């Protein structure tokens, strides 16, 4: 369907987060990636709508107001650790929503390079075993 499913998911996540940052997209999506975007966008907007206090609480724990390189690295490692602890597709969707809030809170606009790599790094980890994530969001309605 695509050449590499993990790459598709990684591209979709970076694109989505940038879209929620109101950042000009640097790269557009393929036909297949755009299909996955539409599915993920609906799920993540619904999580944001239902669990905003829960995500805001996490952001308080993560001290998202601190955009220093040291604290951004700390946020990355804590999110990666939580994902390794609970690797399910639904968790990955929740984490995408969490990143969206982090970006909306700390005012990320593309120039904080450590934050850009946080987005890249977590997109990479979410994209591992993408087959399971794709099956979850396809069948979520299919």
């Amino acid at each position: 369907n695509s050449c590499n499913f993990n790459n598709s998911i990684k591209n979709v996540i970076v694109f989505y987060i940038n879209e929620k940052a109101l950042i000009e997209e640097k790269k557009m999506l393929s036909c297949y990636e755009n299909k996955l975007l539409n599915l993920i966008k609906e799920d993540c907007e619904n999580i944001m709508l239902k669990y905003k206090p829960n995500l805001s609480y996490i952001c308080s724990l993560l001290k998202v107001d601190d955009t220093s390189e040291e604290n951004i690295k700390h946020i990355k490692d804590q999110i990666i650790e939580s994902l390794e602890n609970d690797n399910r597709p639904s968790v990955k969707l929740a984490i995408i929503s969490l990143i969206s809030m982090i970006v909306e809170m700390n005012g990320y606009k593309g120039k904080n390079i450590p934050m850009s790599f946080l987005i890249e790094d977590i997109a990479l980890k979410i994209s591992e075993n993408s087959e399971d994530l794709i099956n979850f969001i396809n069948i979520k309605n299919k």
Binding site: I58, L61, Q78, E81, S82, S90, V91, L93, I139, K140
Partner: peptide
């Protein structure tokens, strides 16, 4: 880096379980 792993984990678990419930009702 793990000081909040349990607290964050518990929050992710509740959101994930609910998403699974919606999926199960598809």
């Amino acid at each position: 880096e793990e000081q909040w792993a349990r607290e964050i984990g518990a929050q992710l678990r509740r959101m994930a379980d609910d998403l699974n419930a919606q999926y199960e009702r598809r």
